[PDB]
Scaffold this active site. Structure first.
Site, PDB file in Angstrom:
ATOM      1  N   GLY A   1       0.797  -1.209   0.000  1.00 17.86           N
ATOM      2  CA  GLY A   1       0.000   0.000   0.000  1.00 17.86           C
ATOM      3  C   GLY A   1       0.838   1.271   0.000  1.00 17.86           C
ATOM      4  O   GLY A   1       1.940   1.324  -0.546  1.00 17.86           O
ATOM      5  N   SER A   2       0.308   2.310   0.660  1.00 18.94           N
ATOM      6  CA  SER A   2       0.810   3.672   0.521  1.00 18.94           C
ATOM      7  C   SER A   2       2.263   3.871   0.922  1.00 18.94           C
ATOM      8  O   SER A   2       2.819   4.933   0.599  1.00 18.94           O
ATOM      9  CB  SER A   2      -0.009   4.635   1.364  1.00 18.94           C
ATOM     10  OG  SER A   2      -1.369   4.602   0.997  1.00 18.94           O
ATOM     11  N   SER A   3       2.889   2.935   1.642  1.00 23.73           N
ATOM     12  CA  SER A   3       4.237   3.230   2.134  1.00 23.73           C
ATOM     13  C   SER A   3       5.270   3.406   1.010  1.00 23.73           C
ATOM     14  O   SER A   3       6.342   3.974   1.262  1.00 23.73           O
ATOM     15  CB  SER A   3       4.683   2.161   3.154  1.00 23.73           C
ATOM     16  OG  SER A   3       4.730   0.852   2.601  1.00 23.73           O
TER      17      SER A   3
END
Length: 632
Positions: A344-346
């Protein structure tokens, strides 16, 4: 513990080889993690025609030299044994039956069964404590004849018992003593999966690994590293065997001895691990799994953390657990580099760097975050802004974890900047290769290069005409990644753009003497794989966004990281997944500390948490590792 394993003939010319003890494995402060311990065994060998009354005499001699566990003795053993341990008792038992046997009206079989049916009551308890001792040796002496050797005692063969028996082998026919080395793990279960295993001597080199061990000159009787550290550093941890040569003639008399090689013990291998940090992390990870479960995350099935020093790639800790529906943990340290996940966003820090280097966005470029509309009615939006329209920086994109900024960035990289109602670009092959090339340069996509076998680079799927997948890759929701990759990536941010090979090996010692390190042989370096193809302003902008995520009231990491004992910075990620067709998220975390001169970096992965309207703070595990490591 020196088994031979070779005897090579030639000019009436034998060469025998003698094994040497394995190198130790120590932590970065010298604490022994993997040692050798001596194991002795008492073995017997049963001949063609060794009598039942002979082995009963050798056993009686042995009960004066060793103590014996009296398990394993079946009641048929005790019953049988009782017959010799009083012939005139058993003769009083079978008064009538003996005449029938002599008349030939019953066979020896029938007689035998009838006698062994004839006591177990008051007069089986006739067996004294010492009688059971000689029976426990007797029972092992009839395991399965021919010259194969049955073991009498294996565990708890004390050195007193080992010396007494060895010096009496001349009075004990068929009795023999062996000495052998096994790995000893002072710290218990900790990191046993990373350490790996050596083959068990009975094993020799394993079938799957054979041919490879034979192309180097080893023998199928040899004990060798089977997995992970023991396998990776096999040839520094193995010794140089003692190689003797003899010259003989006529019937066999040696006329010259010549020590070809005296032997050396294996080299000690020192790791980057700090085992105190390692135990503290495993403790916090367990408490954090338990706390997250108590807050509703009872389907969460993996929890992994890597702790590195970003300046040199040292792996200071590496921990993973698998979690069943009841909270029971199974150790899984190797999941950090052998398992891949949707993170995801990391990854968005990598996305921005890929955007800058292809001139798709400028440092500081502001764009409007808002729901995007594409042809036919497909919409995409940012979690923090489902209904509004906000102008944001690239570093505010990282702080908020704006999907829409990364979508707009990827369309610009695709040569097709967003316009409401557009259709997604048809062929994104070239954009896809450019985006992956950017993520590769920070460690997202390639193998990190760790000095352990079986590292995976993650699942990498084709990008040709699937623009939906392409936009997803820009927010960490297409290709999958290992926690070590996440960790290499955030370390590349923390150390100003240098992507360093992670390593768990730290140095090799020219060990010669028992329990003494001896001089340093070689260092094991985290090599620089590459520098990111980005300017200093470009790297500092991602660093600034990462600090904002952990320290501004609106950063996704504010709750867990704003109060760390030293200032910290990083990025969170959440990815919507499914398990048994129920909605879930993965939660990831990367960060480093202190912001100003980073000395520690980490990644954390939890899989299949509940979909959050209640936002769990699994990042607390990172806040706690930071606080512990900078205690003083």
């Amino acid at each position: 513990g020196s088994h031979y394993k070779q005897l090579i003939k030639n000019d009436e010319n034998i060469t025998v080889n003698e094994s040497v003890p394995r190198g130790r494995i120590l932590d970065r402060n010298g604490k022994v993690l993997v040692d050798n311990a001596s194991k002795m065994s008492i073995t017997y060998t049963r001949n063609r025609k060794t009598s039942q009354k002979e082995m009963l005499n050798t056993a009686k001699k042995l009960t004066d030299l060793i103590k014996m566990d009296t398990d394993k003795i079946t009641e048929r053993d005790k019953k049988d044994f009782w017959i010799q341990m009083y012939p005139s008792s058993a003769k009083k038992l079978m008064r009538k039956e003996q005449l029938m046997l002599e008349d030939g009206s019953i066979s020896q079989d029938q007689f035998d069964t009838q006698l062994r049916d004839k006591i177990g009551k008051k007069q089986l308890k006739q067996l004294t404590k010492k009688d059971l001792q000689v029976l426990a040796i007797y029972r092992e002496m009839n395991a399965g004849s021919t010259l194969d050797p049955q073991t009498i005692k294996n565990e708890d063969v004390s050195e007193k018992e080992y010396a007494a028996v060895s010096q009496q082998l001349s009075k004990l026919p068929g009795v023999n003593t062996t000495m052998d080395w096994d790995r000893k793990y002072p710290y218990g279960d900790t990191l046993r999966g990373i350490f790996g295993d050596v083959s068990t001597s009975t094993e020799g080199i394993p079938k799957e690994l054979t041919e490879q061990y034979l192309s180097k000159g080893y023998s199928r009787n040899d004990r060798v590293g089977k997995s992970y550290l023991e396998y990776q550093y096999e040839d520094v941890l193995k010794g140089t065997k003692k190689q003797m040569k003899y010259t003989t003639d006529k019937s066999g008399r040696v006329i010259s001895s010549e020590v070809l090689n005296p032997g050396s013990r294996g080299h000690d291998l020192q790791l980057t691990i700090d085992i105190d940090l390692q135990k503290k992390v495993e403790s916090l990870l367990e408490k954090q799994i338990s706390k997250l479960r108590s807050q509703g995350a009872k389907d969460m099935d993996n929890a992994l953390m890597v702790v590195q020093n970003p300046k040199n790639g040292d792996i200071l800790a590496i921990a993973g657990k698998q979690i069943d529906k009841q909270g029971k943990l199974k150790d899984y340290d190797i999941g950090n580099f052998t398992a891949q996940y949707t993170v995801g966003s990391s990854v968005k820090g990598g996305t921005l760097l890929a955007g800058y280097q292809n001139k798709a966005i400028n440092v500081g470029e502001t764009m409007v975050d808002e729901p995007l509309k594409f042809q036919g009615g497909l919409t995409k939006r940012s979690y923090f802004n489902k209904n509004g329209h906000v102008s944001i920086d690239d570093k505010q994109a990282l702080m908020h974890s704006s999907n829409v900024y990364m979508f707009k960035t990827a369309l610009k990289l695709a040569g097709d900047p967003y316009t409401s109602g557009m259709s997604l670009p048809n062929n994104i092959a070239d954009a896809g290769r450019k985006l992956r090339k950017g993520l590769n340069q920070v460690g997202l996509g390639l193998k990190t290069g760790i000095d352990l076998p079986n590292e995976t680079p993650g699942q990498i799927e084709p990008l040709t005409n699937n623009p939906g997948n392409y936009l997803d890759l820009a927010i960490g929701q297409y290709d999958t990644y290992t926690p070590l990759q996440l960790s290499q990536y955030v370390s590349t941010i923390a150390n100003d753009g240098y992507r360093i090979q992670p390593h768990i090996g730290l140095s090799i010692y020219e060990s010669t003497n028992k329990d003494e390190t001896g001089p340093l042989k070689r260092k094991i370096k985290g090599n620089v794989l590459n520098k990111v193809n980005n300017s200093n302003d470009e790297i500092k902008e991602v660093q600034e966004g990462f600090k904002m995520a952990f320290n501004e009231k609106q950063g996704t990491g504010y709750a867990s990281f704003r109060n760390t004992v030293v200032p910290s910075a990083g990025k969170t990620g959440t990815a919507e997944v499914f398990q048994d067709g129920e909605p879930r998220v993965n939660s990831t975390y990367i960060g480093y500390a202190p912001v100003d001169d980073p000395k520690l970096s980490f990644s954390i992965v939890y899989t299949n948490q509940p979909v959050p309207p209640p936002w769990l703070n699994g990042g607390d595990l990172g806040r706690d590792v930071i606080n512990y490591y900078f205690k003083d």
